[PDB]
């Protein structure tokens, strides 16, 4: 039932732009917050981006490595979450995962982990 | 095991599904018995055994008074 | 909540019936002759009903054999004194429990029936292996659902009835419904209207219908098993479950309770907590390590126990149950916003969704029809002056026939 | 049901009154000197009130006499334990119940001591007989207030009940919902008598106990408590034979919740079988002997052993007595379901009839004024010109000519 | 009365959480190793929560050391048998209390925790000295507010959690409100109307607001100290107190209950007694030395305990509390006389002063609109029959246009 | 005795006649006393003395607990 | 101690002021332990009086721990 399917990856020249899109199906997309986490080939997990629920301002929080270059967004009308990667470097070659942040309760702006 | 719960904001209520029933539908009666004894020179021990027999006889006498009023609700 | 809708029953009626049967002549001798050899037997009474019989204590074969020959007399050993005390203490404690509870005690104490004796009785009861297993694993619950009626003490034998429970319904799906007031969130005092679902309690599927227990405090819960009592129940149709997914369903009229008392409260559920935060009251949900993780807005909201340890409403601190399970939040418009506060019945206890809507239909009649009769006060005409000639109606007065 | 109409009283208020009297200096010495010879005595305190006094355990004349010289055989050990155990258990019962225990346990007062207190009580022989044959019930109606432990005695007051009313006729009223039997779900209306509970004749009036769970029954004797009672006129009994009597306005409770239930009475069973619920009455040998139709019916215990309503199985009481079925039209059929006040708890027959007259009044009066308040002419248009009356309208006068 | 306005909480949720922590692997070994030297210690579990730990009975170092070597076998001393019995009796009684109450007991018995051990836990609890003093002088009340949850019996140790109360609010002013029906005193039977305040119960100042306890039977009193439980309370503003001095104050809408059941009753207060004597009921107030000193008139009156010992209403005899204090009688017009019985709503539970005033304003709206409009209006003008001719009004009659 | 019962179908109710009253109208107070002994301390290591000493400890702890309980009415 | 009470005739009510608070706001949990001994069986075959008493007392101990194990094998 619960599924997150990311799409839009592939080959891209250094310095251009590519938009990843995560399609959510199985739960309420507007009530939950989404996150983007990548893993470089051979390297560990690196937390990249995070967008909060519509109820909590739609606040985009990025990491230092991609701040100013990446842009997270969401389209609640169609249950989808985007990660716009601009000014891409060669270090950005990685596997990009889409996750859902789990609030400390049913609904809270404090998150304990990445559920899905 | 494998318990769920749902909250409905429209009605301000919550349902906890996933339990198993164990309803008490009827009764079963059992009779428990305690066979008694028909009991109608002071050394060291006899005083204690005598007052213990007094405890026994007073217990059976009190139970004779208690069964006097058959229970009823 | 709906405990007044329940019937009135006699709990010990069956055991007392067997008791009155045991008063009959010869009835006690049948038992004494049946247990003359073994300690446990099955005996069919005069009326044909078969009951289990057990001899737990034999002071006869102790006082008459081990104690009588010594009684001029002298005791030689002290061990026999303590032995007699150990043998007699059970009868003493049983006498105490009966003399306090007027002959009927509940729960059944260990003095009245030890665990060994209780498990033996369950092993020989005419029920299924599943029922024996259930009663054997939860002897604490069997003790709490059983009575001990003292019957008779005739012919050098003592007799009391142990009324044991029969679990005729096992392993069917159950669910517990929790409710809380759902009020508006206006700023003016007493201007708010409140509505509360009253159908809260335990529900269990049984024989194509639902057994409803309005006083969930009387249902005992162990593991995922729910030991309820049909005596404190209501036999409802299955469509009652619709009230959870669609309170405005036509097939069942869901019960509510209306008021204007907007006070803040919280209902701790199995996997979370419902919080009704109204007025200037401060309601929060906190975790034992970081602290406050949510400050509730005015209204009725929910918080799962996944990562939350306490929930505080006003000056009251609740600890949520730390049971493992999945909690799902179902969005929805609070139905109290669908109502007009000017025609809302604020004095309704034993109410329902349709009963309140029909009480609204009447008020809509009373105001839109009858009160609008005020419009017919100034909209009609007074008598013209009873003078010589005739008057015509011009402007808002009677202005004669100059105009002619 | 009507338990909210009762008052609120302080139960041990009398005993505590005696309790604080013992705190005064020398008051304990009067008791200690009175019981220096015998074990039971009568003591009139400083305030003049006379009370019975009893010494149930004397560890002074044991520890100081039989135990002290050895401290200045093994049997002496056990003898001490038997003497001391009571003091321990009395302590335990107090330390949990915060000094006030009820019922009075056997450790606090044995049956011999309680029968002695009843024997020396300053009341009639009939009361002595009643209290002596029902000591278990007297214990359930007695308190044990711990008072003082002053040099060098332990003291607690046992507050015993006095039965000033004995051998007057009593009767228990059982009630159950009485609804209509239509086919539609929400179309039914329900009505239930709320005056259910115990009634006893007392001083030319009736003592009513709405919480019958507090009244204890032994044989045909009923031990009730006046503290949670109501003093009603003798005419209240009329509600059973004539619910519509004007001399007493019988209390009812209206609703629309037609649920099926059963009320086990003393000699039978009431069954309110509404809706699609299946309700039967069964015998232990024959099986099902009656299938109840929709409505409120009754079945005596004469030959019936069980009564089943829906998923609920009730065992009826097998007490011996004559049960009489009094025919009659269910009064709920005497009401029109269109004007029936359905939200009524603390209600009565006259309150329901007056809400029906009031609800009916507004309709006949609104029609008496509005029908027809349009039989009169309204106000002509309030413009500049003059308007005459033609047919049902105000015709511009300027049309002539 | 207002107990339905309360929330629903889980009492042992905290203790059960700690209990489920003890089921984890190794936790029991941490506890067993900490108490190897002393009998009580402080242990922090895996989740970081620090809890006190106590070893009250050591049957291991008695059966294996002082009892094992003797068990050819023969007992020499008889005192050792009684010694073992005295050591084992506590375990037996603990087993009884757990096996009857299904593993959760309240109050905490002396077998579960003796007075020395309880005072030890209070002394070593990390709270203020004033809290230690309060809990130390009232151990009977602390026991009545504490639980005993049986946890696990794994790896040669027995373990149960004792859930003790924390009194975070101490020495703030409290007051108990008593209410009684206030009815009219007419001579006719059904003509009387009644009104009763529902705000009865305990009130205590707490954190700028008031903790209200509607079920005062659950609050325990020792001296002038009141041990209540916030679990069954309501957080109200301070303005609720205005209801005592001004029931018609605008800042708080005081809750009342209307009816027509004028029955006689009495409410024994802390320093006196309220008596509502209606109908032909005879209500008196008497002194044990002098006798009857007052025969109440029909209505609600008060009697102080200063010199009064009993109060009788009908066939009911109440003893008033003989506590020392001053009772003040504040006269005032009974507010039930301010109401008109023709527009007084009698079916009212869970109401308020303004809630009664709103229905009264509504009823007067229909009456002042119906009779004042129908009468002023009643004398209007009918019309002439519609006959295609225009009629003019003269001399109170319609005359056809007669002009030429 | 001779107990009756009637069921009224018109009001759906039943009356169980034939019982006798035993109403509690008033109270009566009686004082129970237990005389104690003023023993300051167990002034005294064989087998029997150990039992008698800890039994005296039970007695003194019981009166101490009752002294703490008496500190409130 | 210095306790007051007032009666309001206008509303038929009474207020008893002058008490001190002692509200229970939170809980505190402590674990109490009872160390037990692993006894397999009374490995003695005698039938004298004192062993007859001590064996049945050990049996009481063992049945108590068995019942506690069955009870452990919570919420109300
Ligand atoms: C107390 C009272 O006035 N009750 C009235 C009664 O007088 C009148 O006859 C009836 C209409 O017929 O309505 C009702
Ligand atoms: C009730 O209201 C509905 C819609 O508001 C209307 O159709 C109906 O005629 C009204 N009256 C009844 C008796 O249903």
Numbering used by the authors:
A (entry chain M): 1 to 116
B (entry chain A): 26 to 65, 71 to 103
C (entry chain B), E (entry chain D): 137 to 207, 211 to 543
D (entry chain F): 137 to 208, 216 to 544
F (entry chain E): 26 to 69, 72 to 100
G (entry chain C): 26 to 98, 101 to 103
What does the paper say about this structure?
The crystal structure of the RB1 fragment antigen-binding (Fab) region bound to the RSV F glycoprotein was obtained to visualize the antigen-antibody interaction at atomic resolution and further characterize the amino acids that make up the binding epitope. Crystal structure analysis revealed that three copies of RB1 were bound to the trimer of the stabilized pre-fusion RSV F glycoprotein (DS-Cav1). Both the heavy and light chains of the antibody, primarily through the complementarity-determining region (CDR) loops, interact with the protomer 1 subunit of the F glycoprotein at site IV. The epitope is largely composed of interactions within the protomer 1 subunit of RSV F glycoprotein, specifically the residues asparagine 426, lysine 427, asparagine 428, arginine 429, isoleucine 432, lysine 433, aspartic acid 440, tyrosine 441, serine 443, lysine 445, glycine 446, and valine 447. From the neighboring protomer in the fusion protein, the residues glutamic acid 161 and serine 182 are within interaction distance of RB-1 based on a 3.5-angstrom distance cutoff. On RB1, the paratope is composed of several residues from both heavy and light chains. From the heavy chain, serine 28 and aspartic acid 30 of the CDR1 loop, tyrosine 56 of the CDR2 loop, and glycine 105 and 106 asparagine 107, serine 108, and tyrosine 110 of the CDR3 loop comprise the paratope. From the light chain, arginine 30 of the CDR1 loop, aspartic acid 50, glutamic acid 55, and tyrosine 56 of the CDR2 loop, phenylalanine 91 and leucine 92 of the CDR3 loop form the paratope. Of the 1006 Å2 interface made between the antibody and the antigen, 191 Å2 is made to the neighboring monomer, which is no longer available in the post-fusion form. The lower binding affinity to post-fusion F relative to pre-fusion F, as determined by SPR, can be rationalized by anticipated changes to the structure upon transition between the forms.
